[PDB]
Design a protein around this ligand. Structure first.
Ligand SMILES: N[C@@H](Cc1onc(O)c1Br)C(=O)O
Ligand SMILES: N[C@@H](Cc1onc(O)c1Br)C(=O)O
Lengths: 258, 258
């Protein structure tokens, strides 16, 4: 049967085409993950329907209700057959859903407005003049919340009680905050998005320092799903064929605006 | 039996005493509503236990699940017997819980950092240099979201799509945002809180213009609760005795710091 794909609106992975009001179904979307989905489907021999996750979240378990939300939840509760998006492979998630080998590598990074006197996480941790935060949900927020590393623990201690809140709901919001804060806000986000934004007008942001960690995005399926094996092989095959690199250049650098 | 009172941490209505770690039960709290609760209890002849609402919300119904949250939810689902807090009397709430006649009047107002070139809601609506927002929940946010009045509709249209978000989770956060935004953020909140903050150090904020609307706070009880009649009479009696005015001066002006 037709495979239900859950994804999320996150540039340049999945974006609404400017003329989406004129289009229907899968044709409404474009981006790295839209292209990858087509490639995976072709190599696994299935037809599919792209759907945007209802709550706009990646996936976390509520500590109280213990209910999974986001794309992970969609897979766990059987609402979708596969998730093709910038979904970070983490221990807690790996325990409830199946992940293909990573199709892209990344690490947490720092985004600053050009000219901000910050070069590293250590720099940020030792001052308060420049506020800094992360998305209000997701693996980056959790990285800091759970970290036992001195510098990161110090940063989380600051972030969790900073007022006003240093957390943002979407990447777009964090970028807007960096751009409109006159250098007084630094955004902690995954290197992939940071690198993409650095090449977008008004070209006033930049990624600074090295990544704080190293991980990857994986295609996810419900635990035990028979689709898992085929998808994993397709990811490895596409990587070996250079297709993944081609898609990266296509959506990040080929049409960079800076 | 002992009456379970649900309330919320909102200065100067209910605040944790600085040495609360040394205290137990009702003695941990102080404020206008803590004093009012004692007065109402005495005049209604009941003993009570103050409890802080679990989700820290005032009360709204989820459009999807249709479940009430906040203090209103606590009353609707029988978790508390009465709510004594700065709970705004609104049509939607009046339909699900009982409200005493108002114990305090108020209106939505504008808080600015001293020196901000804004004198009214109209001023705010006609510009974008100075961002402005409200709490991310509650009657003030709903006032703008539902308003059919031109100026307020224009303001909501701006607020709902402004990036980064102009909404804050708590009053403290909004105040912090006004104070740290160098005049680039104006906070829309109820006049009562605005007036209180204006008299608190560092004395860098002020209420400007008249109130946008007029309403009041009421003591709430589960719909049909027998406690409702007594509480309403106590509110009227306390007002006529001048007790409510005395409490207002006690928590707002007597010890003003500006
Ligand atoms: N990939 C993360 C989400 C995320 O975490 N930090 C960001 O900037 C973004 Br987008 C996840 O899967 O939770
Ligand atoms: N009193 C309101 C909450 C509220 O609405 N605007 C504020 O500043 C505050 Br506090 C309510 O009962 O929803």
């Amino acid at each position: 049967k037709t495979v239900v794909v859950t994804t999320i609106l996150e540039s340049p992975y999945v974006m609404m085409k400017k003329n989406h009001e004129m289009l229907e179904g899968n044709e409404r979307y474009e981006g790295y993950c839209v292209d990858l989905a087509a490639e995976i489907a072709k190599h696994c021999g299935f037809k599919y329907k792209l759907t945007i996750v209802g709550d706009g979240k990646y996936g976390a378990r509520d500590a109280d209700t213990k209910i999974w939300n986001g794309m992970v939840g969609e897979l766990v509760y059987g609402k979708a057959d596969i998730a093709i998006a910038p979904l970070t492979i983490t221990l807690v998630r790996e325990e409830v859903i199946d992940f293909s080998k990573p199709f892209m590598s990344l690490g947490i990074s720092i985004m600053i407005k050009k000219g901000t006197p910050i070069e590293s996480a250590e720099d940020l941790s030792k001052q308060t003049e420049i506020a800094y935060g992360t998305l209000d949900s997701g693996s980056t927020k959790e990285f800091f919340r759970r970290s036992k590393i001195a510098v990161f623990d110090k940063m989380w201690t600051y972030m969790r009680s900073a007022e006003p809140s240093v957390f943002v709901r979407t990447t777009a919001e964090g970028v807007a905050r960096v751009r409109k804060s006159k250098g007084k806000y630094a955004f902690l986000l995954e290197s992939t998005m940071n690198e993409y934004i650095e090449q977008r007008k008004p070209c006033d942001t930049m990624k600074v320092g090295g990544n704080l960690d190293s991980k990857g995005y994986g295609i996810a399926t419900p635990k035990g799903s028979s689709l898992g094996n085929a998808v994993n092989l397709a990811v490895l095959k596409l990587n070996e064929q250079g297709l993944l690199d081609k898609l990266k250049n296509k959506w990040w650098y080929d049409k960079g605006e800076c």
